[PDB]
């Protein structure tokens, strides 16, 4: 385990997350316009897939915001990392989430895997790849939900479509079966 390596990788992860969330917000605007165009036509069951894409990306942007927050938290309390040998309570959440989410966002942010390495190679109490996955039952549940790979609720998709239609001056008749239940 190297400390300065972890510091540099944390700063890089922060910068990368900033860039990614910016450009993802922009792409989300453009793809929302695309969904509005799709709704202009009679194609409805396809706009639901497109808006699934959109809300997945939005969950992802929120999760990246949370991860940037946690990385900056670790970077603000880095000396408290170097001094102690076991992490305190103030850093349990950050370390846990940054180790749990690394394989999730490993493709988007590469340096995150190095951060996970330095945070797994520094600890031995319930640590190590195997024990690091075993002791991952203390991560932020909200971030787990944002990065949860699951079909979003249908009613949520209908609400997303209703709002986009209402904004882009396009008519849309929600599926009452899901819109009312």
């Amino acid at each position: 385990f190297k400390a300065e390596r972890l510091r540099v990788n944390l700063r890089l992860v922060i910068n990368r997350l900033k860039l990614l969330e910016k450009k993802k917000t922009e792409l989300a605007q453009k793809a929302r316009k695309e969904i509005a165009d799709y709704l202009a036509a009679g194609k409805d069951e396809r706009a639901r897939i497109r808006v699934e894409h959109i809300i997945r990306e939005d969950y992802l942007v929120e999760a990246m915001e949370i991860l940037e927050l946690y990385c900056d938290l670790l970077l603000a309390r880095f000396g408290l990392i170097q001094s102690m040998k076991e992490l305190d309570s103030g850093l349990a959440e950050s370390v846990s989430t940054l180790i749990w989410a690394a394989p999730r966002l490993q493709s988007e942010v590469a340096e995150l895997k190095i951060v996970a390495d330095q945070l797994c190679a520094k600890y031995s109490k319930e640590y190590g790849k195997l024990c690091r996955t075993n002791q991952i039952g203390t991560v932020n549940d909200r971030l787990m939900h944002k990065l949860s790979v699951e079909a979003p609720p249908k009613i949520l998709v209908e609400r997303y479509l209703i709002e986009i239609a209402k904004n882009y001056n396009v008519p849309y008749e929600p599926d009452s079966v899901v819109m009312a239940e």
């Binding site: 917000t25 989300a28 605007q29 929302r32 809300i55 939005d58 969950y59 929120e62 949520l156 609400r159 997303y160 709002e163 986009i164 904004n167």
Partner: peptide, 27 residues
């Protein structure tokens, strides 16, 4: 915005939401 300003200046015509979507995401 640039297109809107240029149109309005020329007098012719051409032929926010994120917060509501976030509030909806909070559920």
């Amino acid at each position: 915005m640039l297109l809107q300003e240029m149109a309005d200046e020329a007098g012719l015509d051409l032929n926010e939401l994120s917060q509501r979507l976030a509030r909806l995401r909070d559920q």
